[model samples]
Target: GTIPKPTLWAEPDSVITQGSPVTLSCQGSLEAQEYRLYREKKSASWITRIRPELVKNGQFHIPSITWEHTGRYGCQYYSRARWSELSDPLVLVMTGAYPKPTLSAQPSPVVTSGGRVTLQCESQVAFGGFILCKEHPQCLNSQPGSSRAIFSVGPVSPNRRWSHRCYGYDLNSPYVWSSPSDLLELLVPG
Candidate 1:
């Protein structure tokens, strides 16, 4: 059967608050094999399956959206034979700045001569973890989605040794890690 013109199309509200659930719908002219909703970015496009198989209508639901989810969105469908072009673009606006991840340091950033030290890593973000190592090229362990961790290094004078900065991570979509913090200078007095 020939595809029918969409009976329902809507533009989402101009602005949506962060952590809100957003929904948009589309009506189909004819039955389709699938409905794919897409979000466009400067460099890439993302797709979410709105309907595993199109019926007379479909809706796209985004739960707890963040600023990164803000973008130009659209929809398309496929029949058994081929894919349809994108629908008209809809602008999804996030109301404010992206929530900044938090960072907390612990153990006072001090290291004793020929001893071990720990930097307590913490963050408000759910996915907070670390990459830790000492006096060598790499960390001994890296954890995921954690709020705190410890780093241990030892056996040195202040001038002879130090630990390089590794990354801390937060467990969120579009997974992000901060640039390595400054190298930890070991204050082991000779």
Candidate 2:
């Protein structure tokens, strides 16, 4: 019998805070005997391998991770005297920003048809720019000296609902987006 390829994912989502502990899980078709973890940094030529510090019930933990942990990660298990193919890669992103911003909407959570909606993101710390987004990324212009970012939507239809979130980042390190603000749900009052 052939061993099935395993699946990989990071706990608490892939985005992580610097110096925090995170777990990478490698699950398979059945209980695996041994597991191996692999990692690839951005623009790196080689893939690195590490054994799980602890594997219980079928999970791997990488404790006290730092910026160096930001990379593409994969996993595989050994069984039946053979090794399964590596699991789908999980991109673990580490952020220097400690806290996420606060996202809010004005006028009301429930709005009548064609009502204007204003969404705002406020952060204690300043960054180069802020991103206003839902399922897709929404670009926001940075205020010259302010720490708040705003996104406005108008004439919303009655049958539509919108979900939004925001994050801050610097231009030099565009890849490093800060933690996301709380989700904002807007009901169109259908």
Candidate 3:
């Protein structure tokens, strides 16, 4: 028998505050005799890894995490002399900057295939950059004023899991961004 790929998730959502505690858990074909946790810093190479002294029903915890904990993560479990396939990647992020911006979509968020939609983000502070982050920010643009940004999204298409959000940041520190805006889920009908 083959071990199935385990699933991974972050506790309290993907974005965490600095110096906060967060947990990563996995499940699958466990008795999970042994488990391995993996982290990659959205980079080509270099990965930070973790292992629990004892497996607690297939979960690992970080008592206090740093900005260094921000990245994509995966996990695996060993059972019946075989290891399961790597789990889905879960991205962990940190929040910075000031007040969260407000994001809204024009003409509603629902559209037909091949349609285009406009997304707007208005911020409390005049940020140097406005990043529309959809898991990884598929698009972005700056407006005439520092307090806002407008982005053109699509050639839209249907996706079961695709969604959108926005943030404000200074170009000097792209890594440091404001708290994310509320998610705007795009609906494309077949």
Q: Show the lowest summed lDDT stretch of 10 residues, model 1.
A: 96-105
lDDT of 3 by residue, 120-173 (tens): 899877988887877525545464238888887776656565688888866644
Q: What total of clashing residue pairs does each candidate reach?
A: 5, 0, 0
Q: After superposition, how far is residue 9 of candidate 3 from its true place, in Å?
A: 1.8
**Reference-based lDDT, each prediction:** 0.53, 0.73, 0.74
Against the hidden reference, what TM-scores do the models get?
0.39, 0.59, 0.59
Per-residue C-alpha lDDT of model 2 across residues 1-190, encoded as one tens digit per residue? 6788899978877767767888888887675778888878655567877645556645767687665567787888888888899888888766655478888888676656766787778888777787776642444545413578877766666666677777887665444667888888787764
Reference-based TM-score, model 3: 0.59
Error of 2 at 109 (Å): 6.8
